[PDB]
Amino acid sequence: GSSGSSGARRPMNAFLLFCKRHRSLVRQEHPRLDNRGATKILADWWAVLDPKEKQKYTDMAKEYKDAFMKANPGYRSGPSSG
Predict the structure, then answer these.
(1) What does the alpha-carbon distance between residue 57 and residue 65 come to, in Å, rounded to a whole number?
(2) Domain segments of the chain: what residues?
(3) Buried residues in 66-75 as b, exposed as e (16+ CB within 10 A)
(4) Which of 24, 25, 26, 77 sits between 20 and 30 A of 43, alpha carbons compared?
(5) E strand segments, the chain
(6) Separation between Cα atoms, residue 66 and residue 39, nearest integer Å
(7) What is the DSSP annotation of 4-41?
(8) Where does this protein bind DNA?
(9) Topology of domain 10-69, per CATH?
C-alpha cells in the first residue's frame, strides 16, 4: 500500500493491459493529449468495458504479474488457482 516507499516497478493489470492495447488507439484519436490526457481517455474506455474483456485482461495481468513475482516476501496467494 502506501507506507513510505515507491515500489521498484509493477508489471501490469487488467486495466493497464487495455491501456497498453488501446494506448495507440487513444494516442491516435488524441495524439496531442498527454500521458495524463491519453490515460484519461483510456480510463473511461476501460470504465466502459465488459467482463469477458476484463477477464482475458485480468488473466494477462494475473499471468504477467505472477511471472514478475519473484523477490516478494510479503505476498498473497491462497490455494485455489494453481
Answers:
(1) 12
(2) 10-69
(3) eeeeeeeeee
(4) 77
(5) none
(6) 25
(7) S---S-----HHHHHHHHHHHHHHHH-SSS-TTHHHHH
(8) 8-76
(9) DNA Binding (I), subunit A (1.10.30)
Length reported for the chain = 82
Half-sphere exposure of 34 (CA within 13 A, CB side): 1
> Determined by which method?
NMR
- Residue 38: what residue type? A
Instruction: Find out whether 19 and 49 touch, Cβ atoms under 8 Å.
Output: no
CA dihedral 37, 43, 48, 50 (to 10 degrees): 140
CB 57 within 8 A of CB 14: yes
Amino acid at 23: R
Residue 60's nearest CA partner among 29, 15, 28 is: 15
